[PDB]
Amino acid sequence: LYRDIFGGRENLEAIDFIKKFNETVYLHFPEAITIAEESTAWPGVSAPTYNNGLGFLYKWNMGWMHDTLDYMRRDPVHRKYHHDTLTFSLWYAFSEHYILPLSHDEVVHGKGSLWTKMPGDDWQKAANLRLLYGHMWGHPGKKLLFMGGEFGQHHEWNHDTQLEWHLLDQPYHRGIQAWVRDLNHLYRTHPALWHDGPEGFEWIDFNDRDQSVICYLRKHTDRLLLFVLNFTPVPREHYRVGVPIGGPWREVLNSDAVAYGGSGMGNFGRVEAVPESWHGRPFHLELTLPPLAILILEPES
Amino acid sequence: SWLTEEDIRRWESGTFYDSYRKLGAHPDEEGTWFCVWAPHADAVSVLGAFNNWDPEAHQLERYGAGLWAGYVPGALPGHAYKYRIRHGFYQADKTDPYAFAMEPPTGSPIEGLASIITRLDYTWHDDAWMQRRKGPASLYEPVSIYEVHLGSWRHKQPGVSFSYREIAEPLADYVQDLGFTHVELLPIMEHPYYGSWGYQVVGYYAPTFRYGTPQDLMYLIDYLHQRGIGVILDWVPSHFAADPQGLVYFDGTTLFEYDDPRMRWGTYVFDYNKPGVRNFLISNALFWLDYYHVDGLRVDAVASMLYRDYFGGRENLEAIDFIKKFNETVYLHFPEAITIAEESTAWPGVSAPTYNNGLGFLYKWNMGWMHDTLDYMRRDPVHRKYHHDTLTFSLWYAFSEHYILPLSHDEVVHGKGSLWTKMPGDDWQKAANLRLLYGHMWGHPGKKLLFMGGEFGQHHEWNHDTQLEWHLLDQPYHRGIQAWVRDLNHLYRTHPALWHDGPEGFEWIDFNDRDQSVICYLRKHTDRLLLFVLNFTPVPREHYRVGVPIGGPWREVLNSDAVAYGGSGMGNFGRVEAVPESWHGRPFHLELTLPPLAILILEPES
Amino acid sequence: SWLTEEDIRRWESGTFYDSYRKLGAHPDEEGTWFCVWAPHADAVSVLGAFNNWDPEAHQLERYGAGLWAGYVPGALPGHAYKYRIRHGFYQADKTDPYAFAMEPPTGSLASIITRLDYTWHDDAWMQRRKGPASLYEPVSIYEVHLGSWRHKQPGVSFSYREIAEPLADYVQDLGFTHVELLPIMEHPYYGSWGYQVVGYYAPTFRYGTPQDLMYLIDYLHQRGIGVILDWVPSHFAADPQGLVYFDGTTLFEYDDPRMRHHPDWGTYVFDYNKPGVRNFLISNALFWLDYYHVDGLRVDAVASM
Amino acid sequence: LYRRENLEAIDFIKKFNETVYLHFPEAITIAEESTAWPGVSAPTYNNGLGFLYKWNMGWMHDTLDYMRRDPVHRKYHHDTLTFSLWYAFSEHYILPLSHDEVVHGKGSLWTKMPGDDWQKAANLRLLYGHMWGHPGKKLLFMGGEFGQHHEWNHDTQLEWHLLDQPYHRGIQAWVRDLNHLYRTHPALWHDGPEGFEWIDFNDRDQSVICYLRKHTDRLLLFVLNFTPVPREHYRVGVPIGGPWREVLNSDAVAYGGSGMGNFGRVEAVPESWHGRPFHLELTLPPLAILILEPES
């Protein structure tokens, strides 16, 4: 787009090439997909040419990737002080049709494995990585994950080497792979996650900075999915979260389940909603938040 | 007792948003009550003509929360008073932070600005305006603001401003002729240095003496409402004035200042952590909306509040919660108030509701638009070709907030040049350029704000020591710009296609004519359409085809080049029959001749 | 950080009774952390096959309260190690006091990095254990030295797993409620019967691994028998490679020369004034009660303390 | 100086210095200026600010940055060490290790040095040795003379208890002995360009520096090994032949050192080394400074 009377840094040649590139593809292939990674805040990368966009269908949410990763290397003791980096991502989550992206670029050149990036001991590293993926799947936008991130590989990605598949013998790595498997199953089945527009996202609570917890909602039409995230290894008991609908609520996924390698703290399936106001909501669920865990909950149907 | 036991608790809470009811000076027929916030004071006394200026005459008594109270028989409206606060070894005289009017004993403000005991009795006649007032619902109504500095606007005689009373009728008459909906006033709160324009404030609860009494200001506001004009006040929670008698080290220690040296403009920032500071500031916000029927509050330099260096980091939370609780409190007590913020960082959700993690303002100045637009139009028309993206890309950022287009006093001052001065070419073209800019500003999504004198295309920069150059209203080009701005405002006020600044309200027609510097776009609400064809080059364009969605006859609603505005007169007939074949991917197209440096605004018929 | 800034504050107080988790050898998936208390040492290093037994390759870094910590990538379970502590001019090789497993190099002792992973089969027992309520119930204790009880052939003791089923039956046939085990903690001179201890945190190798003993308790618990361990907080073993003058100075010993001479044990008594000694001793109490679910501790020679 | 320059202040500083030396001709004024403002130490009549001394904050930054680095890595940062001498005579300078460097999480000088305790003590003894050799006067903030562990905490008293332990008592002895060498030998009194001559600066691989500090007759030879590896048969060129003495060795056991040393009685060999007529064949102790002069 850029090159570094006219004095213009924008390479206008290329911008028309990109625009005529994208136009031509969809004309000859109406069902193709074009994705761009653009690390500037160039507007409307994912926008149609007739609105002066670059004409891509998808743009990498590299802002999200940076913010999320920078937030999760910090130690939970310090996460109190960087709460805004987690919450602020949504502000820019809708300017483009976006793919949340974790890629080779971030797991090379001394930047360290995704697992390596996460702080604390081995259980906490697995917990942190399980949470990162949990919030990543809950966060609006499509999903991309590079090889080896799915089991939480220790080593940086080396092209001269094959992934450390031997790590699949260790339980935590197998649990991370199962967590991702289970995440994709929920993703494929619950349409509340299909719509990454402002439609599909509602905040439940973002103001718990001391305990570093965030609650948000994902909703297409009638269906809704509740996300409660504990970003600290300290378990939370009798934590109330406001909800729109009353009645029995189901626990659809628990990051801390033993099947994923977790402590196993959870809410045992059914939680009953209390017709008492919380977070500006008519009802609320009083839940137990496991250490460094993401909880996905559904009203019962 | 003066203070209810619930009061003190609210002051400790930081929830006393009625605090002007009890703090400051409140007269009876037999005396006046005095109340001061001075937590680190060992003693407080009121001194005045009513008691020999004797420090021991009336020693206020310490209550809870650092609040002091006392009654003085014979202290009457129109006396001056002074607080003598003792911090241990040292003693100091201070002005009332809650002063309801301040007046210079000398006659010169920079010398002395003393508090005067005042009664705020005033009867309003603006019921109809206040019953029909619409704050947040104005997002779907035309909001066109005329920004004014009262002393600079008109002078009754050289170097002497119009009074509040005397200004009312000239201001209302002129604003109505212009078609502006609101007036924005640069800070009215008491300030020593006139050259501050009011942004260095000492008396937050006192309207400035220079233009009259407190009730004189209400009469002005009352009058403006009866005339159907809104009043937005500029408000400065960002910092307080550097005057020793003022808020600086009120108790001999940091009070409105940060207790901590490291943080803290410098030093003269409000410590938003303190419950008393948040009380003082938030009450003052409502105080203006309550006692003076103010329609809106505009907060400047929000970035200086949000960050600290403009693991805790750059962001200041104190300020953001205060800003958030400020906006929440305003809309709770005044659902039809308006809050506007100017933030020169790209802080997200300034215009967003707090429950969405926003700051809670209703409006944000689109200063990006202002910069881009201005950077574009100074360039010579030969060159506008090479910067076409600066103009078109303004809309990529035009919907991130509820925005007000921000042509402001800061833009026309300190060497930046008059808006007129900024435009390139000979005098005809500069007037043309100015007419084009205003045309595009009204077409662009967002509310419109224009500072005094821009409506003439005034030659000189804004000088607070004089009145705008109304003499140029005699030479033809300048009444034409005024006629153009009025006609734009009349079009704005009437056509609902311009009221909706959401992405729904805009459709692109064409933005690719970089060589001819032409822009075609649509502004829509429901059935209603407005088509904008803009020529940023002198070269007239003939048989310029412009695609349109609906066919049939189209009308030429406004022509920047009409001689009534000072233009060449090159124009379409005003009857334009749509050609039934395609242009710009549209079913029909209009074939027009585009006048020089002009904007065409076109509408289909019935 | 291996160690919290709070964990050190707990160490200064002598209020860390979970000190075992911070101290000793702790394997992770890429290596093991080593943590040793050596306050009056100028340098502390871990030496093992995983670094060619060279002091320089891995030197622990001091934190608060004379606590040393360091990570050695490639240090693995089943590896043998030793700490080389330098007190100014002189250096000495030491055993890990918090070693969870010690095995002799000769086969006739070297600290071994070990994992204590075990899944228990005595949930039912623990819920029913009487403790203080046992005063109103019968306790009949069968005292045992595991080496002396039953033999596979002359001079060959029974392993932990092996003895369980023969012993549990004999104890059950006679109706005893508990077995009191003469000290199982690692001790060099078998003829001491276990009362001069080198590995307070390590069960003796002669009868198996830490897991072998954990199961023995598992079985005895399932079969309804209690296990009481004999505990020796009164004194520590004479051999030097062990706790003697650990940091190059008196550490577990009394610093003052007058207190150190004592009847029965001299300069081998624990300095209970030191907070670190109290951490070490009380943590060991819970350690046996926690990781091995022991029902009881029997303290001998209380008068000597 | 700034706010772009503030001339009010610049004339004030110039008149301050002019006035002081008029009323007190033998006073001293020292300035700390953190920009590259020229002629701080220069007389007002030459457009200088009129100070007698300037803190060499440039030196301190380079020096500390170099020694924060591990000897294994110092190879790649050799120029940071050697280049201090390009800017070493721009003003009348005082080498500075002030309180501002041992506060706000910057770490005590001791804490800054890399490796285990011996290397930390060795590094600080080496650092001071080089600082005493480098041109310029010397300033050390209290507690640096023991190499105390903790940052300067004004709310408490210095950790004098560390003076009981060997490594810190050795550094105190080293500073005392360095100060003895300083006052006794005039070769260090002249911080002029004439005073300093390079012996060798291009041993980047082995991270060694050899230099000479001169006044007239007197020479002082400084050889510095910035890696924990003893160097043997290391030849260093010298102007004079004959017997040379070892005046000081940082690695003496009395300072906490290993004790590798030449211990005096070093005879120059007339073989050209480092572009010099005669050469010394020496042993370079670990992370140590040798100071040698011709025998007289």
Q: Are B505 and B445 in contact (CB under 8 A)?
A: yes
Question: Chain A closest CA to C1's CA: distance in Å?
Answer: 8
Burial (Cβ within 10 Å: 0-12, 13-18, ≥19) of residue C86: buried
Check if B315 contacts A (Cβ < 8 Å): yes
C-alpha distances out from residue A141 to A59, A195, C78, C284, Å:
10, 8, 47, 52
C-alpha distances out from residue B465 to A126, B188, B400, C8, C112, Å:
68, 16, 38, 68, 88
* Cα distance between residue C103 and residue C83, in whole Å: 15
**Most B CBs within 10 Å: which of A10, A38, A52, as the mutation test of the B interface?**
A52
What residues in chain C have their Cβ under 8 A from chain D's Cβ atoms?
42-43, 59, 88
Which residue type sits at B600?
Answer: L
Kindly determine whether residue D117 and residue C43, on different chains, have CB atoms separated by under 8 Å: yes
Q: How many CA atoms lie within 13 A of A110 on its CB side?
A: 0
Residues from chain A that touch B355, judged by Cβ atoms under 8 A, are: 203, 280
Which residue type sits at C280?
Answer: F
Active-site positions of A read 37
Q: Are A109 and A103 in contact (CB under 8 A)?
A: no
C-alpha distances out from residue D204 to C285, D62, D72, Å:
57, 16, 11
* Cα distance between residue A195 and residue C23, in whole Å: 51
Q: Are B246 and B310 in contact (CB under 8 A)?
A: no
Burial (Cβ within 10 Å: 0-12, 13-18, ≥19) of residue C264: exposed
Of the residues B190, B222, B300, B487, which is catalytic? B300
Spell out the SS3 assignment of B519-551.
Answer: EEEEEEECCEEEEEEEECCCCCEEEEEEEECCC
Which residue type sits at A20?
Answer: K
Cα three-residue angle B324-B326-B332, rounded to 5 degrees: 100
Residue A185's CB is within 10 A of a number of other CB atoms, namely: 11
* Cα distance between residue A216 and residue A201, in whole Å: 7
| Chains linked to B by 3 or more Cβ pairs within 8 Å | A
Check if D255 contacts C (Cβ < 8 Å): no
Residue C35's CB is within 10 A of a number of other CB atoms, namely: 24
Question: Chain A closest CA to C115's CA: distance in Å?
Answer: 14
C-alpha distances out from residue B577 to B544, B554, B560, D157, Å:
14, 6, 21, 93
* Residue among A22, A11, A17 nearest A46 (CA): A22
* Residue among B492, B495, B503 nearest B445 (CA): B503
Kindly determine whether residue D167 and residue C43, on different chains, have CB atoms separated by under 8 Å: no
For strands C156-157 and B155-157, give the pairing: unpaired
Q: Evaluate the CA torsion angle A131, A134, A139, A142 in order and state its sign.
A: positive
C-alpha distances out from residue B491 to A281, B442, B522, B603, C150, Å:
43, 9, 15, 11, 108
The DSSP bridge partners found for residue B46 are: B83
* Cα distance between residue B108 and residue D206, in whole Å: 76
The DSSP bridge partners found for residue A99 are: A60, A142
* Cα distance between residue B519 and residue D227, in whole Å: 70
Could you tell me where the beta strands, DSSP code E, fall in chain C? Answer: 24-27, 31-37, 43-48, 59-62, 67-73, 80-87, 90-94, 102-103, 110-112, 141-144, 151-153, 156-157, 178-181, 185-186, 199-203, 226-231, 296-299
The DSSP bridge partners found for residue D243 are: D267
Residue where the block lists tokens 């593809």: A25
Q: What is the DSSP letter of B134?
A: -
Q: How many CA atoms lie within 13 A of B528 on its CB side?
A: 10
* Residue among A119, A115, A124, A99 nearest A38 (CA): A99
Active-site positions of C read 300
Residue where the block lists tokens 């649509």: B522
Residue B380's CB is within 10 A of a number of other CB atoms, namely: 10
Nearest-by-CA chain A residue for C30: A154
Q: How many CA atoms lie within 13 A of C177 on its CB side?
A: 11
Spell out the SS3 assignment of chain D.
Answer: CCCCCCHHHHHHHHHHHHHHHHHCCCCCCEECCCCCCCCCCCCHHHCCCCCCEEECHHHHHHHHHHHHCCHHHHHHHHHHHHHHHHCCCCCCEEEEECHHHHCCCCCCHHHHCCCCHHHHHHHHHHHHHHHHHCCCEEEECCCCCCCCCCCCCCCCCCCHHHHHCHHHHHHHHHHHHHHHHHHHCHHHCCCCCCCEEEEECCCCCCCEEEEEEEECCEEEEEEEECCCCCEEEEEEEECCCCEEEEEEECCCHHHCCCCCCCCCCEECECCCECCECEEEEEEECCCCEEEEEECC
The DSSP bridge partners found for residue A224 are: A219
Check if D259 contacts C (Cβ < 8 Å): no
Residue where the block lists tokens 């907070």: C275
Helix (H) or strand (E) holding B278: helix B275-291
* Residue among A271, A208, A217 nearest A244 (CA): A217
Q: At what angle do helices C160-173 and C210-222 cross, to 10 degrees?
A: 20
Instruction: Give the rounded distance of the alpha carbon of C171 from its chain centre.
Output: 27
* Cα distance between residue B102 and residue B96, in whole Å: 9
Which residue type sits at D203?
Answer: D
* Residue among C124, C129, C281 nearest C201 (CA): C281
* Cα distance between residue C142 and residue C211, in whole Å: 23
Kindly determine whether residue A154 and residue C29, on different chains, have CB atoms separated by under 8 Å: yes
Q: How many CA atoms lie within 13 A of C113 on its CB side?
A: 27
Of the residues D5, D18, D26, D32, which is catalytic? D32
The DSSP bridge partners found for residue D222 are: D211, D291
Q: Are A127 and A255 in contact (CB under 8 A)?
A: yes
In the numeric block, which tokens belong to residue D58?
């440039």
* Cα distance between residue B277 and residue B283, in whole Å: 10
Q: Which positions ≥6 away from C104 have C-beta within 8 Å?
A: C110, C205
Query: Does residue B336 sit in helix, strand or coil?
Result: coil
Kindly determine whether residue B313 and residue A82, on different chains, have CB atoms separated by under 8 Å: yes
Residue A280's CB is within 10 A of a number of other CB atoms, namely: 9
Number of H helices, E strands in chain B: 14, 29
Q: Are B411 and B419 in contact (CB under 8 A)?
A: yes
Dihedral in degrees, nearest 10, Cα atoms C35, C37, C41, C47: -30
Question: Chain B closest CA to A171's CA: distance in Å?
Answer: 35
* Residue among A111, A120, A186 nearest A149 (CA): A111
Burial (Cβ within 10 Å: 0-12, 13-18, ≥19) of residue A116: middle
C225 φ, ψ (degrees, to nearest 5):
-110, 140
Q: Are A1 and A59 in contact (CB under 8 A)?
A: no
Nearest-by-CA chain A residue for B512: A52
* Cα distance between residue D81 and residue D206, in whole Å: 13
* Cα distance between residue B378 and residue B390, in whole Å: 12
* Cα distance between residue A263 and residue B90, in whole Å: 63
| Chains linked to C by 3 or more Cβ pairs within 8 Å | A, D
Check if B313 contacts A (Cβ < 8 Å): yes
Instruction: Annotate A102-151 with DSSP letters as a single string.
Output: E-GGGGSTTS--HHHHS-SSHHHHHHHHHHHHHHHHHSSSEEEE-TTTTT
* Cα distance between residue B205 and residue B235, in whole Å: 11
Burial C157-186 (b: 16+ CB within 10 A, else e): bbbbbbbbeebbebbeeeebbbbbbbbbbb
Burial B228-255 (b: 16+ CB within 10 A, else e): ebbbbbbbbbbbbbbbebbbbbbbbebb
The DSSP bridge partners found for residue B603 are: B555
Q: How many CA atoms lie within 13 A of D164 on its CB side?
A: 4
Q: How many CA atoms lie within 13 A of B29 on its CB side?
A: 0
Q: Are D244 and D199 in contact (CB under 8 A)?
A: no
Which residue type sits at B599?
Answer: I
Q: What is the DSSP letter of C212?
A: H
Technique used by the depositors: X-ray
Q: Are D64 and D71 in contact (CB under 8 A)?
A: no
* Residue among B290, B271, B356 nearest B329 (CA): B290
Instruction: Give the rounded distance of the alpha carbon of B132 from its chain centre.
Output: 21
Let me know how long chain C is. Answer: 305
Query: Does residue A72 sit in helix, strand or coil?
Result: helix
Q: Are D224 and D132 in contact (CB under 8 A)?
A: no
Let me know how long chain D is. Answer: 296
Kindly determine whether residue B315 and residue A81, on different chains, have CB atoms separated by under 8 Å: no
Q: How many CA atoms lie within 13 A of A32 on its CB side?
A: 14
Kindly determine whether residue D117 and residue C42, on different chains, have CB atoms separated by under 8 Å: yes
